[PDB]
């Protein structure tokens, strides 16, 4: 019934405050909610849009700040003074009852960095992959022979360590099919114009 | 503040299956006015949480009725009389009896059954582009098992390395329902030209002893 829309992404350095935006179209008081790494939920606070009254959870009554836009029938959450815990997924819900899509935040003191994309060739199916380190901010795109090669395909989430991501992926095929035929990688990195293509050769 | 706990974190079905998952509260979800603000969400793969149930028992709108909450107090239950494809996904209660704050149960993980199969597992030297930058990482894919947990450990030289590692798993497959799992261990070169002998070794419920793929630096 009620649809939120949310802001997109945003990436902060430790110390620094994020605003994000929740505009409701549709026919409650506005609730924010942190969902970290785990999947775990984190009530931060309400607002009652009509006048403006506020709930904080203790744990961020200090550090968040919720307003509204009746105007524009937006709603504001501004958290400061941001921590690494505070790296999350980050809803506005109507009345507990709808949610909006969500906005991430990246908290991290990384400059964007292109990846360095490395081929992984084998020491009756056989198993290549294509590892991707030392990048931010997400995301990256990684397809096999131009999305033609899709089946026996596992691309592993990106993980942020050291204030880098790391991705990889492995592909596997019919002892046949390789070296006989080429397969590459294909990794985009639009943050850092990173296009590049790994073609995996036998060591 | 309130408690949730659910329970079980992860529960295997078989499509057509009853299923049932337990919310436990740490205190009376009873307020005084009489209400019990016990609710359930769905979040499936890739959305936002949705309303299935609030106060104990109250179907959502549009909420098929093969979705059905009961229970009292502190102890409350989530039932699927049969359970489809579009109901795999992350279950959550949560209480908003006493606030602030509103708490929620770490989710139970509604997932597909099915053999069980042992990892494929493959290991990687490093890229002699990486070696080129001083560089060294060493990546093991464990791929195509169930059930999803998985222990890895990295020897070398016959000893465990704990440092440098990073790993990542991915969702239950929408193919096979099986599950896999990426690690790569990052050195420098000088710590990968100072020992031959690399192996990733996995425990699994497919096998009493350890799994293991391994290779020798110098070829």
């Known amino acids: 019934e009620v649809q939120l829309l949310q802001s997109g992404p945003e990436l902060e350095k430790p110390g620094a405050s994020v605003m994000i935006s929740c505009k409701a179209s549709?026919?409650?008081?506005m609730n924010w909610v942190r969902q970290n790494i785990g999947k775990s939920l984190e009530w931060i606070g309400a607002i009652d849009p009509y006048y403006g009254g506020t709930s904080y959870n203790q744990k961020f009554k200090g550090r968040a700040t919720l307003t509204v836009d009746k105007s524009s029938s937006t709603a504001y959450m501004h958290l400061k003074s941001l921590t690494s815990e505070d790296s999350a997924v980050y809803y506005c819900?109507?009345?507990?009852?709808?949610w909006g899509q969500g906005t991430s935040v990246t908290v991290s003191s990384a400059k964007t960095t292109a990846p360095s994309v490395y081929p992984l060739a084998p020491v009756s199916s056989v198993t290549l992959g294509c590892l991707v380190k030392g990048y931010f901010p997400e995301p990256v795109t990684l397809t096999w022979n131009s999305g033609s090669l899709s089946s026996g395909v596992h691309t592993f989430p990106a993980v942020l360590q050291s204030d880098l991501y790391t991705l990889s992926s492995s592909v596997t095929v019919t002892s046949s099919t390789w070296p006989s035929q080429s397969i590459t990688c294909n990794v985009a990195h639009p943050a850092s114009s990173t296009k590049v293509d790994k073609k995996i050769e036998p060591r | 503040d309130v408690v949730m706990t659910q329970t079980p974190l992860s529960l295997p079905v078989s499509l057509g299956d009853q299923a049932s998952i337990s919310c436990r509260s740490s205190q009376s979800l009873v307020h005084r006015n009489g209400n019990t603000y016990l609710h359930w969400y769905l979040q499936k793969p890739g959305q936002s949480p949705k309303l299935l149930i609030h106060?104990?028992?109250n179907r959502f709108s549009g909420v098929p009725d093969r979705f059905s909450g009961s229970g009292s107090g502190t102890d409350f239950t989530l039932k699927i009389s049969r359970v489809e494809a579009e109901d795999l996904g992350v279950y959550f209660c949560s209480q908003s009896t006493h606030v602030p704050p509103l708490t929620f149960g770490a989710g139970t993980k509604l997932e597909l059954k099915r053999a069980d199969a042992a990892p494929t597992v493959s290991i990687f030297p490093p890229s002699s582009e990486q070696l080129t930058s001083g560089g060294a990482s060493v990546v093991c894919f464990l791929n195509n098992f169930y059930p999803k947990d998985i222990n890895v450990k990295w020897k070398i030289d016959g000893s465990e390395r704990q440092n440098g590692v990073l790993n990542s798993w991915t969702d239950q497959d929408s193919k096979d329902s099986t599950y896999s799992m990426s690690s790569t261990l990052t050195l420098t070169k000088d710590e990968y030209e100072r020992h031959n002998s690399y192996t990733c070794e996995a425990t699994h419920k497919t096998s009493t002893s350890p799994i293991v793929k391994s290779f020798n630096r110098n070829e």
């Open positions: 549709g026919s409650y008081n």
């Open positions: 819900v109507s009345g507990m009852e709808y």
């Open positions: 106060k104990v028992s």
